[PDB]
Amino acid sequence: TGREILEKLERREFTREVLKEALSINDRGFNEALFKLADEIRRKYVGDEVHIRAIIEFSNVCRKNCLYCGLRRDNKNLKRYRMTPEEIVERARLAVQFGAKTIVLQSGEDPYXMPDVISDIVKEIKKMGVAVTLSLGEWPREYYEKWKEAGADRYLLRHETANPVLHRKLRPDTSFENRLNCLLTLKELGYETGAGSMVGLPGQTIDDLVDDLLFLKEHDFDMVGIGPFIPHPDTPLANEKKGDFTLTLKMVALTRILLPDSNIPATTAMGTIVPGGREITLRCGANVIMPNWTPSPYRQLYQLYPGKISVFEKDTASIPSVMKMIELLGRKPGRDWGGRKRVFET
C-alpha cells in the first residue's frame, strides 16, 4: 500500500524495499503525496531560497566517448569550441553583475585547459566574491587539488549510474570505480561535492535507481544533480527511449527525503523533457536552479542532449528568467553563496 510506504519514508525507514516500492508504485495519489513530502522536507530544511548557479559551458571538446553524450569524442557532427580564459572570466563577471552568487564552469573533458588555465580562471572569478563550482569531469587528484587551492568551492561529478556494469558500458573510457574515486577525492580535498545520475538510461532498472538513491545516501553528497536521459541523435543511444519525467521527479523527491539538507537542482534536462519541468521539480524537492550563461555562438554548440530551452532566447535572458521563475513560485533567490547548511540528525 502506498500509505504504508509514505509512513516509512516519513519515519526515515530508508530500506531498499521501501525505496523500491516508492519507485514501483505508480498511483497518482501516492506520487502526489511523495512530492508533497519532499516539498515539505525541502521547505523545512533548506527553506524557500532557490540558489542560482550561473553555468558557463566553456568548451565542448571532450576526450571521452560516453555513449549517451552529444559531446562524445566520436561525434563528428558538432562544431567544437573553446572560450578563451578572458572570455570565460568576463562572462562570469557579467553573471556576477546580473546577481549570480555561484559561477559553475562546465565543459567536456577538454585537456587544453587542464589544470593550469582552469586555476587561473578560478582565481580571477574568485576575486569577484562568489562561489565557484567546477564540472570538468574526471581528472587526477593533482588537478583537483590545484583547483581547490586556486579557490574552487564545489565540484559536480554526477555518478551517472551506480551500476558498475552499466556504467562501464555507457562510459567506455572509465568506470564507476574511477568515478567514485574522483568523488571521494573531491570530498577529501574539501570541495562541496555533487553527484547524481540520469534516469531512464538504456538497460537501467528500478533496482538500479534504488542503488543510485542508496549510493547518494551512503556518501551524503552536498549536491545531487538528477535528470532524465535524453537521447541524442548523434550518439549510439540515439534510438533509445528518453527517461520518464515522473520517474525522474520521484528520484528528485526521494533524494530530498533521503538527503534533506542537500542542494538539489531542478535541472535543465527536466525542463527540456516537459515544458515547465524545472518549476515542477522546484516544487518536488529541488532548491537550486542553474540558468545557462554560456554566450552565443557557443551556447547552441553545447548539446549534451537535444535541447530547446534557452537556445533561442538572449544570451543574458536566463538569469532574469529564473529570478522571475523564483518569484512566481513564491520562493526567494539565494542571499548568499547557497553552500550546504548541514542539519545534523540521528
Ligand X SMILES: C[C@@]1(C(=O)O)N[C@H](C(=O)O)CS1
Ligand Y SMILES: Nc1ncnc2c1ncn2[C@@H]1O[C@H](CSCC[C@H](N)C(=O)O)[C@@H](O)[C@H]1O
**Where do contacts with ligand CPS occur on this chain (CB under 6 A)?**
28, 31-32, 35-36, 39, 97-99, 245-246, 249, 274, 280, 283-284, 320, 323-324, 327, 333
Residue 267 interacting entry, from ligand Y, Cl ion, ligand X, none, C-beta within 5 to 8 Å by type: ligand X
Which stretches of the chain bind ligand Y, using CB under 6 A? Answer: 68-69, 106, 108-109, 135, 137, 157-158, 160, 198, 227, 229-230, 232, 269, 304-305
HSE-CB of 253 using CA atoms within 13 angstroms? 27
Alpha helix segments (H runs only) across the chain: 2-10, 16-24, 28-46, 85-97, 116-126, 141-149, 164-170, 176-188, 206-219, 245-258, 268-273, 277-282, 318-328
Residue 72 interacting entry, from ligand SF4, Cl ion, ligand X, none, C-beta within 5 to 8 Å by type: ligand SF4
Segment near ligand SF4 (CB under 6 A); pick from 65-73, 191-199, 240-248, 261-269? 65-73
Residue holding cell 567546477? 134
Mark residues 96-125: x for contact with ligand SF4 by CB under 6 A, - for none.
------------xx----------------
Dihedral of the alpha carbons of 159, 162, 165, 168, in degrees to the nearest 10? 0
Q: Which of 5, 69, 134, 152 binds ligand SF4 (CB under 6 A)?
A: 69
Residue 191 beta carbon to ligand CPS: minimum distance, rounded to whole angstroms: 24
Packed helices 141-149 and 176-188: angle between N→C axes, nearest 10 degrees: 30
Closest CA to 267 of 319, 227, 327, 324: 227
Q: Which is nearer to ligand SF4, 31 or 60 (CB)?
A: 60
Upstream peptide bond of 295 is cis (omega within 30 degrees of 0)? no
Residue 64 interacting entry, from Cl ion, ligand CPS, ligand SF4, none, C-beta within 5 to 8 Å by type: ligand SF4
Packed helices 28-46 and 245-258: angle between N→C axes, nearest 10 degrees: 40
Q: Which is nearer to ligand X, 5 or 161 (CB)?
A: 161
Number of residue whose CB is nearest Cl ion = 133
Number of residue whose CB is nearest ligand SF4 = 69
DSSP three-state, residue 292: strand
